[PDB]
Structure 1
Amino acid sequence: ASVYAWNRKRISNCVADYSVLYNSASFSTFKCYGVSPTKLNDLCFTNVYA
């Protein structure tokens, strides 16, 4: 989508494997501002907005 109409996907009621997303080398920017990248597989959240 465009940036004025950015698509919001709700990630909920599932188990999330952030290690595959983090170990991917295609991403040119992986910057977190409230959590740690190595603790994404350990913490639990109610829902994720993408």
Structure 2
Amino acid sequence: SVLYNSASFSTFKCYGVSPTKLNDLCFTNVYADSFVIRGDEVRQIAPGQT
């Protein structure tokens, strides 16, 4: 919930899960990724689409 208001993110697309429900279930081995990309291909980085 703290990651929802402090930084107004341009895009927030929670795939395969409901964004609000992430608080009440225990996952396994969370992985984080980071890089820099142009503004147009942010929609391009999505599952399935080329």
Give TM class, smaller chain.
0.5 to 0.7
Q: Name stretches of at least 5 consecutive residues in structure 1 with no aligned partner.
A: 1-18
**Runs of 4+ that moved beyond 4 A:** none
Which of the pair is proportionally richer in strand?
1
Aligned match of 1:42:
24
Superposition CA RMSD, Å = 1.4
**What letter is aligned with 1:36?**
S
Aligned match of 1:16:
none
How many residues in Structure 1 have an aligned counterpart in Structure 2?
A: 32
Q: If the length of structure 1 is used for normalisation, what is the TM-score?
A: 0.52
Q: Name stretches of at least 5 consecutive residues in structure 2 with no aligned partner.
A: 33-50
**What letter is aligned with 2:20?**
T
Aligned match of 2:10:
28
What is the CA–CA distance in structure 2 between the aligned matches of 1:49 and 1:33, rounded to whole Å? 15
- Return the offset for 1:35: 0.6
